[PDB]
Each structure stands twice: as structure tokens, then as C-alpha cells.
Amino acid sequence: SARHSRFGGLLSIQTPDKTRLTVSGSQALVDEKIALQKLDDSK
Amino acid sequence: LPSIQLPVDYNNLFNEITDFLVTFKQKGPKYMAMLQKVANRELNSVIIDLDDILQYQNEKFLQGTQADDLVSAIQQNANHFTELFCRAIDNNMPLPTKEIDYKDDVLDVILNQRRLRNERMLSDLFPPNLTRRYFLYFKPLSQNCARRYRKKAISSKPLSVRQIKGDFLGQLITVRGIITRVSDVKPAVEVIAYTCDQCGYEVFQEVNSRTFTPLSECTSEECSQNQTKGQLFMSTRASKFSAFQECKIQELSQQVPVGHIPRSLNIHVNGTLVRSLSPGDIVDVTGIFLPAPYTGFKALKAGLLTETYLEAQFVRQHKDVYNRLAKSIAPEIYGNLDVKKALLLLLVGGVDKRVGDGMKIRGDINVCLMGDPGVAKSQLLKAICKISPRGVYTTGALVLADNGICCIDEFDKMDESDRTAIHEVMEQQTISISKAGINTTLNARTSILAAANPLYGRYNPRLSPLDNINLPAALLSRFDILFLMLDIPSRDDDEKLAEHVTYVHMHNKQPDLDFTPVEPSKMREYIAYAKTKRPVMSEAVNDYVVQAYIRLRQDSKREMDSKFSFGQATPRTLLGIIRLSQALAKLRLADMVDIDDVEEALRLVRVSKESLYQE
Amino acid sequence: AHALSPRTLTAQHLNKLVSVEGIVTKTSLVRPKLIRSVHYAAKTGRFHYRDYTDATTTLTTRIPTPAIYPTEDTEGNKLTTEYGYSTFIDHQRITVQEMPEMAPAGQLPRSIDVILDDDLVDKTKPGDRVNVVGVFKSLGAGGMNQSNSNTLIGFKTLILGNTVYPLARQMLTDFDIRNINKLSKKKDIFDILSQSLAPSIYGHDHIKKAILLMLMGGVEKNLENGSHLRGDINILMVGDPSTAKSQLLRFVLNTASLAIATTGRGSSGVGLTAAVTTDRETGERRLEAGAMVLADRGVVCIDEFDKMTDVDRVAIHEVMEQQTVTIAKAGIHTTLNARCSVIAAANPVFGQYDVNRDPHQNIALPDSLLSRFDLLFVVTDDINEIRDRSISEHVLRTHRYLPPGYLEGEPVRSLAVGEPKLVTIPFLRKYVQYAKERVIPQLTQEAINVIVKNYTDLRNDDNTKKSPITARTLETLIRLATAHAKVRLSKTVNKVDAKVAANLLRFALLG
DNA sequence: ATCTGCTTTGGGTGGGTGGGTGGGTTGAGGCAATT
DNA sequence: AGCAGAT
Numbered sequence A: 001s002a003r004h005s006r007f008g009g010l011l012s013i014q015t016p017d018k019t020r021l022t023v024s025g026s027q028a029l030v031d032e033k034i035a036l037q038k039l040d041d042s043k
Numbered sequence B: 001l002p003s004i005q006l007p008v009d010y011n012n013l014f015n016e017i018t019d020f021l022v023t024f025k026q027k028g029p030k031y032m033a034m035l036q037k038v039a040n041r042e043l044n045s046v047i048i049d050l051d052d053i054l055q056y057q058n059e060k061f062l063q064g065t066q067a068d069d070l071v072s073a074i075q076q077n078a079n080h081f082t083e084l085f086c087r088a089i090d091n092n093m094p095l096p097t098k099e100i101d102y103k104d105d106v107l108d109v110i111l112n113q114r115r116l117r118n119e120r121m122l123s124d125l126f127p128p129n130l131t132r133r134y135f136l137y138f139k140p141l142s143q144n145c146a147r148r149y150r151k152k153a154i155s156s157k158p159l160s161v162r163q164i165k166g167d168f169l170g171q172l173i174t175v176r177g178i179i180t181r182v183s184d185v186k187p188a189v190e191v192i193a194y195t196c197d198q199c200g201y202e203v204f205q206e207v208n209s210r211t212f213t214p215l216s217e218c219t220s221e222e223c224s225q226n227q228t229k230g231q232l233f234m235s236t237r238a239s240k241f242s243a244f245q246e247c248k249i250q251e252l253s254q255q256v257p258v259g260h261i262p263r264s265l266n267i268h269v270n271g272t273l274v275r276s277l278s279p280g281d282i283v284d285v286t287g288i289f290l291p292a293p294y295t296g297f298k299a300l301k302a303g304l305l306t307e308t309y310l311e312a313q314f315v316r317q318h319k320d321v322y323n324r325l326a327k328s329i330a331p332e333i334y335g336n337l338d339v340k341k342a343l344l345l346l347l348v349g350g351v352d353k354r355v356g357d358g359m360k361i362r363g364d365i366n367v368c369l370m371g372d373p374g375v376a377k378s379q380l381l382k383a384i385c386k387i388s389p390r391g392v393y394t395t396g397a398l399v400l401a402d403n404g405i406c407c408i409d410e411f412d413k414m415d416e417s418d419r420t421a422i423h424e425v426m427e428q429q430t431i432s433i434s435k436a437g438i439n440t441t442l443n444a445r446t447s448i449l450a451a452a453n454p455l456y457g458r459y460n461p462r463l464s465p466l467d468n469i470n471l472p473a474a475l476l477s478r479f480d481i482l483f484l485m486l487d488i489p490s491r492d493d494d495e496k497l498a499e500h501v502t503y504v505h506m507h508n509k510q511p512d513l514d515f516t517p518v519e520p521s522k523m524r525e526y527i528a529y530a531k532t533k534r535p536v537m538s539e540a541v542n543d544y545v546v547q548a549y550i551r552l553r554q555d556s557k558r559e560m561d562s563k564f565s566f567g568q569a570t571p572r573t574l575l576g577i578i579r580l581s582q583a584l585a586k587l588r589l590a591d592m593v594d595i596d597d598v599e600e601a602l603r604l605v606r607v608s609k610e611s612l613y614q615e
Numbered sequence C: 001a002h003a004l005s006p007r008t009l010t011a012q013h014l015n016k017l018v019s020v021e022g023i024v025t026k027t028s029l030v031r032p033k034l035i036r037s038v039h040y041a042a043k044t045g046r047f048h049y050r051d052y053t054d055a056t057t058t059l060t061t062r063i064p065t066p067a068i069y070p071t072e073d074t075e076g077n078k079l080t081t082e083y084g085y086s087t088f089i090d091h092q093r094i095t096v097q098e099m100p101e102m103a104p105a106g107q108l109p110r111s112i113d114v115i116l117d118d119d120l121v122d123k124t125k126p127g128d129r130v131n132v133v134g135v136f137k138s139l140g141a142g143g144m145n146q147s148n149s150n151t152l153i154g155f156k157t158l159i160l161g162n163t164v165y166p167l168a169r170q171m172l173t174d175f176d177i178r179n180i181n182k183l184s185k186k187k188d189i190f191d192i193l194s195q196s197l198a199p200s201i202y203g204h205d206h207i208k209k210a211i212l213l214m215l216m217g218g219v220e221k222n223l224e225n226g227s228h229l230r231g232d233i234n235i236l237m238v239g240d241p242s243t244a245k246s247q248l249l250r251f252v253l254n255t256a257s258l259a260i261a262t263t264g265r266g267s268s269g270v271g272l273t274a275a276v277t278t279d280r281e282t283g284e285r286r287l288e289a290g291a292m293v294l295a296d297r298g299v300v301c302i303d304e305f306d307k308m309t310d311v312d313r314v315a316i317h318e319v320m321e322q323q324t325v326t327i328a329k330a331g332i333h334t335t336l337n338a339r340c341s342v343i344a345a346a347n348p349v350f351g352q353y354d355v356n357r358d359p360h361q362n363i364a365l366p367d368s369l370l371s372r373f374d375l376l377f378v379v380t381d382d383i384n385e386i387r388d389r390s391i392s393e394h395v396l397r398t399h400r401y402l403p404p405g406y407l408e409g410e411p412v413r414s415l416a417v418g419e420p421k422l423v424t425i426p427f428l429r430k431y432v433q434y435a436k437e438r439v440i441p442q443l444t445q446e447a448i449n450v451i452v453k454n455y456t457d458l459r460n461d462d463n464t465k466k467s468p469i470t471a472r473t474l475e476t477l478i479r480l481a482t483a484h485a486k487v488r489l490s491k492t493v494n495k496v497d498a499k500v501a502a503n504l505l506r507f508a509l510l511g
Numbered sequence D: 001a002t003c004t005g006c007t008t009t010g011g012g013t014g015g016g017t018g019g020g021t022g023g024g025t026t027g028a029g030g031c032a033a034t035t
Numbered sequence E: 001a002g003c004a005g006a007t
């Protein structure tokens, strides 16, 4: 992320069914593969 | 945990509150109209008038359907009734009448998604405070209304900080005092909104204490059923914050007993009451007197002693022209027409300071009073400082006097540091601070009004003025007008002064009756109007003042040939003369500076010193 | 045998009812103390309560109760505290010090800590003489807990008060009031009362009259505009060594209802106004009253006025000028009231007044400070035969006094707690209290004419004055007339009062 | 997953072999340098 | 009471 760690951008990804998951990170704000990678890694 | 049987049932009280809100009228019901305005986002503060509750109670009694005493219950225990009333309002909030952008609000979207998720789960919430957009306050029971209905109003009866004892805790009381400190507004958290990085849900936690322990593990149904360990994280965008401000209230001088020291009491202000208190105001704060329990180890150590504070709920704040103004400046002294005229000229301080060539001529008229002890110097200073809007009274503060007249008493005694400070102010009109801790520079275009005693304590005719004055000759020269007031014994004047002072002591009023002093408010507003104005000068007046300057310089040189002269005239004297003329024109309210104003200024400078020195 | 003092309280008296006498030197701030809390269970619809106890709230030892408010019912219901129904009581701690004059030889006075709860919270202020009844106790573990490794520290101790008895105002009876009135009807009451002051000092009639008028005081007037005229009389004595100035100061100290003693080199600027300290009980910043503040509505006697420093003189200058104290320290801004009369004694610059040199050269005090004294008395020790014989005989007679209950050659050394003829000191105190408590004289046109004539003549007169005439002299004249009217128990100031004030001021100024 | 155990706030109911570049800050008194 | 460690 270009900005600092505490910038604080929050995400809401929509699953094929109508449920929303939350991800943090500008890269997630831009991309979806990064979002899924973070979802897997945060487990 | 044993139990008692108190004679209060909250169910009848809740029913009474609901009936009062829905039915009371004083158009439609007053509180229903207020709730309508609250729903439409117009209003954000609901004030409950205990007078209205008393009126409703007495109307019900007159109808014969006697009910519980709501006002006494509120006064005796007020913390509970805030929540009760908030619940009642939440139940009866009318639907909005004007369409609003619901989707813009974060909370609306979040709660809609929560509803959708709950519906999906069922097919296979949030605290009430979170959605509240209003604050509730109690207006005390007014004295007149209590007397009208034959009742005693404890809430509106004022108390000093001394009378607020430990048995008043938990009540609705009023305090009288002056505010000594107000803190900056800051966000105090009421409800915290978390998020789950795995489950995709949101949690809410309520905070009603100085401290709290944040959640770290998801508690959602999905997480527990799946056992997935999803960390909870805070989100400030969804939380609920209330403006917070802490103040301090101190006893008035007249309330402290003999041989005692004043006390102070903390005040908490939340919601829309913030910024309604500033240091120096004398107020009647109405609030709920509550304790402030400690937490954790500090609670164990502190024992049973408790801090206390007041939850602010309602705040009541307490409250020929030349000759006339001069004589009205201070009617309790014996008239000093020239000094009063000069002081008025100082007060108005008219000047056209727009040189724009790198710097400008000083835009303030400075006045100095020097006299043997016995004349009304301190009284003149006090009066001239009370009249002025920016007057600051000090004894040998400058920041408060910026762009205003400064009232310095005992000028001669002052220390060298302050003398250098004023010397800087006059020349540069700037306040400069050079410290490692802080480096702040402030402009100061403020006038100085000084009072001093001669070197030996009294004026000595044998010694010339310069030797009598301890202050540097440059400082005296920089003064625009220097007044020397002397105390000469005389049968007639002494008799007049004695009669005046003694009449004042016997009757407590002004003795004079030939003329009626002008009201202070009219004089102040006229002075402000004059300050607003801006005169102008022509070429003929310029030539006249130039001629006056050469005449004055020749006369002053001739006088300086001897030792009696205070000091030879300089260009500073020319600038002072034109400054006085400009101020006089401002008083006249005319652009064109008449020769009369210049002549009067010349007479004033002459009589400032020569009139009394020649005596 | 339980009537004791802070010095005589020992470990033998623990757990016993004792009565202690001394001076109050400190007083903490009043803070409420939690005793009972009442909660409400919304679902169950019943109230609960909890009782708290501490080591200082009861006489029998119990298990300590932390001040944590219960949150959950026995069955798990949510509990909401009802503050309006809970019970808190006030709590204060004071320190009582042994009387300095009763201390042993070469030992500083000792003190004991006392606790006052509920209705005994604000019955005393520092500088008051009290008699405290309570139970002598001990607290804490006193180092028996392993945390403290000292092994040589004792237990804490203190008194839980039951009563406080003042030792300042005399209770007047109908007989006393009638006697006061009967005496006041006399035509020479002023002379009798003045002579009754300090019977053992020979001469100094006018200084005694001034001291009487100072004890009575004037009438305080504050105008609507803001001017605040003081009704107190200040007195300064300057003279040669051994002229009875200090003994007059001490007599004023003993007779006056409230009086504080200070010297020149023993005082300080902070010690006169107030000091910034921290409260032991609560750890909160506060102010401690000084000599001038403690003597509010009373008298302060300053000995060796000329041995003070300028920095310390500035504080007294401010106090006398404004009658208040302004404090800006440690984030504290306030204004303490100091409305006291100042009686001071000083020595000339060269230790003995010189007639040749002008008064300015004889006194080292600033003129501004001098203008604030109503009466300036210059007393000189002039050697004379008749006067010397009289004074020596008086002193010899005084030195031969023997107090009843003692034998010749015997060097000089309570029962309950509840309880032209010279006027005795107790009756003088009663008279002063009565007169300054229920008389407020008002001026009248005749006294007005007398005062204006006297001021006019005094200011523009060829004869030199030991002090320079000023408009302040007019205020002093009015004040003296009002005080003399008070002496006679009159509601109005008449010609006689003006003529007495004039004579006193004329003696002060032109010998 | 449960049982066992130490330490706060800040303050003298931890201290001066922990110090004052870890915070608790006015008041008085002695000493050199400045006068 | 919250958190740090041993069975």
C-alpha cells in the first residue's frame, strides 16, 4: 500500500449469494485476487 | 443482596410519562410537535420543562384523576428518568414528513444489511442508543411556577459549592458561581462498532464508564457454530460519539464564609450543551449531581471516598457633547475637565494609519497621569478601564489589551523587564516571545494609560519635572500627552472637595444637580460609533498644522534654553497633534478636519503640562 | 483523667474516650463517602441494597468492603444503581496541635489527626481553639504485612470525633447587656474604657484611645458603582527603644477577639497571603491561608515593621490597598478575602528619632505604604525628672505583684468540657463585642460641618505636620467619628464624635 | 482448557546499592557572583 | 481484575 499502515480503508466483498465479507487493505480495495489471498491467509 | 419496598413503581411513572408526552397541550401537543421536528432531522435536542409536568399534574388533579408526583420523583432521582423518557420518546417517534437520503447515512445501510442477514439466517439487534439522534435535558422547576401552584422548587433554588453536600447526590440541583476553566470539546464514545474479518458480521458494545475493555474475539452465531476464530477490530466510522467537555465552577467572593478559601466543583457537558460555558461567566448551572466511581486497582485503593461531578442540563447566563461625556466619565470625583477630555480622546483613538511605505505612524494616543499622592489617579484609571471594552487593569495582561487601551497603575515602580516590554510595544506594536518551549509572535496595537508618582513621592518645585520623573526621557517623549496633576491646598477648593466626598459618604449618590450625567450605555455606543468612522484632511489644514509646528518648535527651543522646560518639541509632537486632531474629528463625525479640532488639540497639549507647571 | 492534650496522648489511652485541646492547623477538603447503595432490577421489579463499612466509619472491626457497585443480581439480572436512593455521608480530616505556650522547654508542639463525619464536617477552621471528644484508635496492619520490610514502624492512630467545642465569642446575658447600656450612658465612657486598656503601661493615653477605636472599627460601605470603602482603622507606632510598643501590640493581641502575631524577619510574602500545597486525603491542589487571610474580619499585629524586605512589603501593600489577595500560581486563579486591621510598630532609621531631620529621613518605609495608615504615632523617650520618677514608681509597683494562691518566693506555673474605676478585661471584651455587633451609626449634617471645617483648616495651615495632609485624612476623620459613635452605642454620629476624632487626629499630626 | 500468581494506578501503608533524559513543582535557606 | 506461565 502506498499510504501508511494506519490509513484505514475498509472493504465489503459480495459473495455469489447476498452476503458481504470485510477485508482491510488498499490492495484489496483495488483487486480481488489479493482480497481472496488475504481472506485465506487471515485464517 | 437483600431487598427493600420503596413507595415508587416505575410502571405507573412510565405510563404517566407516555400520557404526558402524547396528551399535554399548551395547535397540537407541544412535545409531539417537538418530536415531529426531531424526526425530520431539524431538531437534535429535546428539553423537558418541569413546569409543564407540574401543570399537567395539576390539570389531572383538577379533572379528579389524581396521579403520581412526577416532578418530585424526577428531582429526587433524575438519572433513571433520562432513560425512561428516552424510551418513551423512542416508542412514540412519529414518521418523517420530509423525504431524506437514507442511503447516504452509513448506519441506515449497515442496519439494512443486518436485517437482510438475519432474514437469510432465519430462512435457513443494536442498542437503542445507537440510532438515537437527539439528546434529552431537564429544565428545572421555575420559582414563579412553583409559587403559583404552592410548591417548593429545590431544583431551581440556587446553591453555592459549599452547600452541595454528600446527601444531594443523585438529585437535580442548581449551582451558582463563576466558571474558571473549560476544556476543549472532544469525542466521548457511547457505542463501539466492531467488525469480523471472517464472518462478515458486526458487533456493538456499550460504554458507560471512564474505561472499557475492547472485544478481541468474534461472538457472532456463525463464528461460534463454525468455531472459526475471527478477530474483532474497531471501526470509528460506525461508532457513536457524543461531544464531551469538562468545566470547573468556583464560589463567588460573597458566598465564602469569613476566614475561608473558595471551593470548586467539576461539571460535565454532553451533547448540544457544549460550548455554552466559557471562563469568567457567572452562571446558574442546573445538572444531576452524581459520583464518579474509580475502576480497577484505583477503586480498591481509593476506599469509600468518591469523586463527584455535575451533569449539565440547563445554563442561565447573567448580564456640548464633549463636556457632557467628560463630566459623565467619572461623576464621583471632583471635576477635571482637561484630564477627562484627554482620556476620552485616548478612548476613541482616532487615527489614519495607512502609510504603506514600509511602516506607519502609530495608531494609538497614549496618556500618562503623574501626580502627588492624594489626587484621584486610581479612581480615574478604574473608571476609564471599566468603560472601555478592552480595558485591562494591572499594577506595576498586555495580551488581553491588544487593540485596546491598557490600564497600568503604579507605572514608576514597574520592573525593567516590563519597561522594556512596553518600550517594544510602543515602538513596534508587537509582542515577541523567544523561548525553546514556544516561539509565538503576536501583534499589539494597544494604547497605554499609566499612573505614577514623582521620584521623592511628591512633586518638588525646586527640581524640574525631568528630575522628578524617574522614567527615561525617551519614554516620556514617546507619550502622546503627558498630564501632571498637583495637589495645591486652597480654602475654597478644599471646602468643595470635602463637601462632595462627605455628601457621597452620607447619601451614597452623586451630589451634583446642575447637570444630569449621560447614561453610560449611550456614551459607550457613541464611542464605538466614533471608532468606526474615518475622517480626512486637506492641504489647507496641512499648512495650518505645519505653521503651528514651527511656532511650537521655536517656543519649545526658547523654553529649553532654560531648565524649566519638560522637553523640546520634536516630530513626535507633530504626529501627536495630528493624531489628536483626527480623533477630535472622529468625535465630530465629519470627514473634513476643521481648524477648530486642531486648535482644541493644541490647547489640550498646552494645558497638559504648562497650565499646572506655571502655577 | 481522660482530659488530655496531643502531647499527653500515649499508647496507654488507645480504645478509650478522650478529650483533647489544641489549635487546628490543617483541614482537608470535604469529600462524600459511600455507605449504602440501592439498585433496581428492571425485570424482577424489586430493589436491592448493599452496605459498606470502613475502619473509620465504625467502632467495631469488620471485613473491608471495596466500593465496587454490584452489577448483576443473584440470578443474573442486570442491576442499575439508584444514586438518588443511595446514602453518602461527608468526611473530613483535621489536625489539632498542642498549644505553643503549654509546651515543655525546648520542644516544638505536637499534633494528632482527627476525623469528623456527617454534621461535624465544617465546624472548625485553621487557627481556631477547639476541644475535641472522641475515641482513640489504631488502623491498618502497621507493618505486620510482609510487604513492608521495615520491622521498626508502629501503627497509625487517630481520633474519631464525637463533639467539637469552640474556645471565640462570649455569650451575653441580659444582666451584661443592661450593665453595658448603663455604662454607655456615662459622659466619660471613652476615657474609662481607654484607661482600662493595658493598666500596667504608664501613660500613652492617646495610643490607648486609638487602639480602642481600632477594636471597635468603623462602618463598611460599598457603593453600587463599585467603590468599596473600608471601615477598618490601621495604626503605626514609631519611636525610640523601650517605649512599650511591643507590649501594646501584645495586649491588643490578647484582648482582641481575633488577632494574629507576626514580625518582620520571621514572616515572608507567601506566609502572609497563602501557600500552595497538596491535600493528603485526596491529593488535590489547594491553598492554605496565611497570616493576613487567617485574620479576616480581625486584627494583625506586625512587630518590627521596618525590618521587613521590599518583596514581603509588597504583599502587605496590596492587602492594605485592596483588602483582598489575588493568587496566580500552579494553575490557580482566585481572590481571598483579607479584611483586617493592621497595627504595627517600627523603629526610626538611626534607632532613635531625630528632631532636626525631617520625618522622611527618619522613617525608611515608602510614602505610599505610609499613606495607608489612619494614625501615625511618633513617640519619643524624653528624659524628665517628674516623668522618670512617676514611671519608675509605676514599674516598681508592677514588679511587686503576687498572684493569689501563691506564697512569697514561689515561682509561677479543666474540670468540665461541656460547660474612674477600671473596667475588667472580660467586661471590656463583652462591651466591644456588643458595640461592634449591634450598632451601625449614620452621619448627620452637624458632624458633617465639623468634619469639613476641620479638614479645611488642617490642610491649609502653616504649621508643619508629621504626616502630609491628604484626602485620605477626610476618610480617616469620618472613620474615627463613626467608631467613637459606636463606643457610645449610638445610631447617629453627632458633634461630640467629630470633635473627638478631630482632637485625636490633631494630636497624631501636630503632637 | 484450567489453575497459580504479580501488579498497578501513581504515591510515600515500596523505596534510596535504580536514579532524575521515568513524572509527581512551590517554599525556604545557603552560597557564589554580581553588585 | 488482566494478563503471563506450568500441569
Ligand SMILES: Nc1ncnc2c1ncn2[C@@H]1O[C@H](COP(=O)(O)OP(=O)(O)OP(=O)(O)O)[C@@H](O)[C@H]1O
Pocket (backbone or CB within 6 Å): B332, B333, B334, B335, B372, B373, B374, B375, B376, B377, B378, B379, B380, B410, B453, B497, B500, B501, C368, C371, C471, C472
Ligand atoms: N477630586 C476628588 N474627589 C473625591 N475623592 C477624591 C478626589 N481626589 C482624590 N480622592 C480620593 O482620594 C483617595 C486616594 O486616591 P487614589 O487612591 O485614587 O490615588 P492616590 O492616593 O494619589 O494614589 P497612590 O495609591 O498611587 O498613592 C481615593 O479615596 C479618592 O476617592
Ligand SMILES: Nc1ncnc2c1ncn2[C@@H]1O[C@H](COP(=O)(O)OP(=O)(O)OP(=O)(O)O)[C@@H](O)[C@H]1O
Pocket (backbone or CB within 6 Å): C200, C201, C202, C203, C240, C241, C242, C243, C244, C245, C246, C247, C248, C345, C347, C391, C395
Ligand atoms: N511606659 C511603660 N510602662 C511600663 N513598662 C514600660 C514602659 N515603657 C517600657 N516599659 C518596659 O519596657 C520593657 C521592654 O520594652 P518594649 O519591648 O515594650 O519596647 P519596644 O518599644 O517594643 O522596644 P524596641 O524598639 O526595642 O522593640 C517592658 O518590660 C516594659 O516593662
Ligand SMILES: [Mg+2]
Pocket (backbone or CB within 6 Å): B377, B378
Ligand atoms: Mg493610586
Ligand SMILES: [Mg+2]
Pocket (backbone or CB within 6 Å): C245, C246, C303, C345
Ligand atoms: Mg519591640
Ligand SMILES: [Zn+2]
Pocket (backbone or CB within 6 Å): B196, B197, B198, B199, B200, B201, B218, B219, B220, B222, B223, B230
Ligand atoms: Zn465472525
